[PDB]
Structure 1
Amino acid sequence: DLICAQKFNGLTVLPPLLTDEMIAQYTSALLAGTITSGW
């Protein structure tokens, strides 16, 4: 593959600190606080 070809030549990708399931829990808090409390 190509993502593996880049890795073997010193080019690697670090993972983000917040997982996509942690960002999706931050969004729910904004949605749940807006509906039940407003601004």
Structure 2
Amino acid sequence: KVTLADAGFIKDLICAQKFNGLTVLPPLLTDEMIAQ
């Protein structure tokens, strides 16, 4: 249901943000360990 935005996987608008010193860090707990 939730449409995620600004995912920032390493490889659009996300890269346009990325080239000006804006970064997204990944969370410590993944999406699978939360499900565990």
Q: Which TM-score tier does this pair reach, normalised by the shorter chain?
A: 0.5 to 0.7
Gaps of at least 5 residues in structure 1 are: 26-39
Instruction: Report the structure, 1 or 2, having the larger helix content.
Output: 1
Give TM-score, length-normalised by structure 1: 0.62
Give TM-score, length-normalised by structure 2: 0.66
Q: Which has the larger radius of gyration?
A: 1
Indicate the RMSD between aligned Cα atoms, in angstroms: 0.4
Instruction: Report the structure, 1 or 2, having the larger strand content.
Output: 2
- Which consecutive segments of 4 or more residues in structure 1 shift more than 6 A? none
Aligned residues: 25
Q: Percent identity?
A: 100
